[PDB]
Design a protein around this nucleic acid. Sequence first.
RNA 1: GUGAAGAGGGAAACAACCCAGACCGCCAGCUAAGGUCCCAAAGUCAUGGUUAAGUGGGAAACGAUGUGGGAAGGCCCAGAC
RNA 2: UCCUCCUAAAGAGUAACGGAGGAGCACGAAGGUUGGCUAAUCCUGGUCGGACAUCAGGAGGUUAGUGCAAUGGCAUAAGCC
RNA 3: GCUCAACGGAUAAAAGGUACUCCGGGGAUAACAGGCUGAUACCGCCCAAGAGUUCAUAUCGACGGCGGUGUUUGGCACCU
RNA 4: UGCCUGGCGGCCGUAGCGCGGUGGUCCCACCUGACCCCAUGCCGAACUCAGAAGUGAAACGCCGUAGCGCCGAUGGUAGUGUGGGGUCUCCCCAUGCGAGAGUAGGGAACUGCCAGGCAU
Lengths: 94, 80, 136, 58, 116
Amino acid sequence: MFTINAEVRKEQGKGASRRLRAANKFPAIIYGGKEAPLAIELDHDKVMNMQAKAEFYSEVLTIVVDGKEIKVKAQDVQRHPYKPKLQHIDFVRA
Amino acid sequence: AGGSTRNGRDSEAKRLGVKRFGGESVLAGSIIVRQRGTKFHAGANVGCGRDHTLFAKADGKVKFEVKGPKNRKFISIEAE
Amino acid sequence: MLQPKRTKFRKMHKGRNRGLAQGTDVSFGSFGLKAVGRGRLTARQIEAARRAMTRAVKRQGKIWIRVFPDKPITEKPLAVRMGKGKGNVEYWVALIQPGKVLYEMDGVPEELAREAFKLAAAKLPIKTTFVTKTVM
Amino acid sequence: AKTIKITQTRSAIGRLPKHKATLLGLGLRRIGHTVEREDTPAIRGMINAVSFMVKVEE
Amino acid sequence: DKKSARIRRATRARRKLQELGATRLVVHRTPRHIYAQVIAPNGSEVLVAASTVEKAIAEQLKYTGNKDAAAAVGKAVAERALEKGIKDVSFDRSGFQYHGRVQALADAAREAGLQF
RNA sequence: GUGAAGAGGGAAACAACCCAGACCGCCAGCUAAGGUCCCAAAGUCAUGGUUAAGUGGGAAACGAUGUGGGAAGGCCCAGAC
RNA sequence: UCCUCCUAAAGAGUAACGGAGGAGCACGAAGGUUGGCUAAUCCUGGUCGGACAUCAGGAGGUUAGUGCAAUGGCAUAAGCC
RNA sequence: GCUCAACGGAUAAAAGGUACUCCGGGGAUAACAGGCUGAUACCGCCCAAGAGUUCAUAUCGACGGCGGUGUUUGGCACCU
RNA sequence: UGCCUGGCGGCCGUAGCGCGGUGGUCCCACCUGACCCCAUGCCGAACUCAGAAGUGAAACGCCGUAGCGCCGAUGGUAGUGUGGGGUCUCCCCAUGCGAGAGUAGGGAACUGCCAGGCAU
Ligand SMILES: [Mg+2]
Ligand SMILES: [Mg+2]
Ligand SMILES: [Mg+2]
Ligand SMILES: [Mg+2]
Ligand SMILES: [Mg+2]
Ligand SMILES: [Mg+2]
Ligand SMILES: [Mg+2]
Ligand SMILES: [Mg+2]
Ligand SMILES: [Mg+2]
Ligand SMILES: [Mg+2]
Ligand SMILES: [Mg+2]
Ligand SMILES: [Mg+2]
Ligand SMILES: [Mg+2]
Ligand SMILES: [Mg+2]
Ligand SMILES: [Mg+2]
Ligand SMILES: [Mg+2]
Ligand SMILES: [Mg+2]
Ligand SMILES: [Mg+2]
Ligand SMILES: [Mg+2]
Ligand SMILES: [Mg+2]
Ligand SMILES: [Mg+2]
Ligand SMILES: [Mg+2]
Ligand SMILES: [Mg+2]
Ligand SMILES: [Mg+2]
Ligand SMILES: [Mg+2]
Ligand SMILES: [Mg+2]
Ligand SMILES: [Mg+2]
Ligand SMILES: [Mg+2]
Ligand SMILES: [Mg+2]
Ligand SMILES: [Mg+2]
Ligand SMILES: [Mg+2]
Ligand SMILES: [Mg+2]
Ligand SMILES: [Mg+2]
Ligand SMILES: [Mg+2]
Ligand SMILES: [Mg+2]
């Protein structure tokens, strides 16, 4: 089990996503199921540590947003081209 | 000192293209498109010339549209 | 020395080398040598770094080369004025963007791949780094 | 009746011809020239286009 | 195969009448029956129709797929067209040869009063 | 786009860069870029950090217990180094 | 001198002793019209007959063809009788 | 009826030499030198396969890489 | 009005392939024959004509099926107009536009006119 804390993104696009990656964060999206897709943003160093395990990309993860846990799986991740960093993560609702 | 070349040639620009665009009122006989092949095709009230030139047979607005199973591009004149 | 057998055309424009790369992840092998900088390599630089890691592994394991030099580079001869046609094709390069994985390797330990890719990156003009395979 | 103040705050010397025509459409002539225009989307589009060299007041 | 090559054989003159804006008579030929219908220049609706599948025509006949049936069909569709006020049409052979039952039909429609 | 055909202020000086377009006059005021210890007009301003190289105030591959910050890790008062 | 593509920056146009190729004709049918047809290649079998003639079937679906260079077109064929 | 193809075609009809030369002009255009640049050149440096009895680094240093100078051969044609 | 079929369209792959099944009263198809209309650069194969014994084998139509083809978000990324900036062969900031590929997912078309048949 991996428990990740998130916040709903108040704004999207290039300037916001660049500005989160400036402030040590990165966006992600939870989609799948019948629920509408949810645009979250994460702390980078926590998830970068958590993703080093294959358990991360195999198990079911719990995402806490507004105190509401969502059990997901890591569908796809966009990485930085030459730096050990994360751009964006897809989460499918398990 | 020395050298030469074999690649000096080129031809004159034939000024093809679309002379009147969509929603653009024309007179009868006005050239709409000059083109080599039938990159476009003649629809309603539009004739195709000897060199695949698309001209208006009547007066009105140009209508671009995609029809047919092959998704070919047709040019038609709406009435006006 | 890598070189295309046939080409549709003998010469090519100089172009540019802007943008990010596509061959980013370690596809085939386990360890990779990823380019961080930007530039153009050659068949000599590629073959010299291949020799340095083949010898550093004592031909143990398997080495992939992800890049290939397909761009011809012309030069004009000495004491030739700037006109009178394009210069003669002299050598072949591969345009390298940041993020391009240059080489891959497996069948060896990690530390041996580190020291082999370090001996190879010492033969390369651009700045490189060491990468490993990743699930997803 | 929904009118706003527009004030040219920079020069128009090295600017584009399209930006000079935009300042002509706003009626701005010199720097510090405060003009009073109605508030339409067309006006807001010209102010959007030259927002670097104007100062809209309200 | 034969159906498709007949359609390819017909789809040039059909598109030509499509751009001519022609009210068009459509013939269809089978070994047993023969069909006819007058189609609006939009190609989406018919005006009159006749066949050897209709009782009023087939019951007066020996066999539905001979020339006498085809002439009775072209006569009936012409008399219905002139009843409805359709006079000038253009004959679509629909990929058949202008020969035999098709020719006897169009000759019957010409004789009954259509102009094509 | 500017110069050419355009002066003024700045970039030490520096047609083409930055700011800005000279009708004339005034021992009036506000500002732009750029600046505020002295040459030389204006902060030896305030608050919090970094640098010890005159770095600032010229340069790469590469090399190094320079130093500041951050996140994690493995040994450890059953005694670590 | 003329044609085609790129350079040419998604309208047109756009230069260099820039990158690559052609033309200075042919056809009394290789034109017009009506009617009809649909390739390349490969597989199997089959007299001489063979990698490869012609014949029959199947895959394929225009990778062929276009009087000639290239490009754009071409199944309603502009291709073939 | 023109390969007037130097293809908007100077005439129906035309090749060369000048160190015996001359005039008008040009730094709009070359040679010298200066300038910009630094491909080349020269001088360094990086990795270290190997040679060096063993031993890469005493001395050398393959395959390749990064710089400096303005010093050669050159490029341009900004001054004259 | 329902079902089925034929013709002509609309639309142009969410509509196409594949795999399996199914249909014959009518329709359609194959099918029988050909001195004739007409036809084969030979051949009734095709075209055509005269027909209706047989069969739905093929073809066609319908139903089912996600092996494909196809469609396809959200978010992000690339790019880029204007303005500004840097370590200026290339990037960054504000703002506006915003892909492609890929993912989730969808998905085994929909519809009009006329005519016929069987039911209603
Ligand atoms: Mg931006
Ligand atoms: Mg000035
Ligand atoms: Mg000045
Ligand atoms: Mg200076
Ligand atoms: Mg000064
Ligand atoms: Mg003041
Ligand atoms: Mg200031
Ligand atoms: Mg002072
Ligand atoms: Mg102080
Ligand atoms: Mg263009
Ligand atoms: Mg353009
Ligand atoms: Mg024909
Ligand atoms: Mg054979
Ligand atoms: Mg032809
Ligand atoms: Mg001349
Ligand atoms: Mg001339
Ligand atoms: Mg003289
Ligand atoms: Mg000069
Ligand atoms: Mg001069
Ligand atoms: Mg000189
Ligand atoms: Mg220098
Ligand atoms: Mg030793
Ligand atoms: Mg040494
Ligand atoms: Mg060497
Ligand atoms: Mg010198
Ligand atoms: Mg020199
Ligand atoms: Mg010049
Ligand atoms: Mg001088
Ligand atoms: Mg089936
Ligand atoms: Mg038959
Ligand atoms: Mg069957
Ligand atoms: Mg998007
Ligand atoms: Mg998309
Ligand atoms: Mg489907
Ligand atoms: Mg199906």
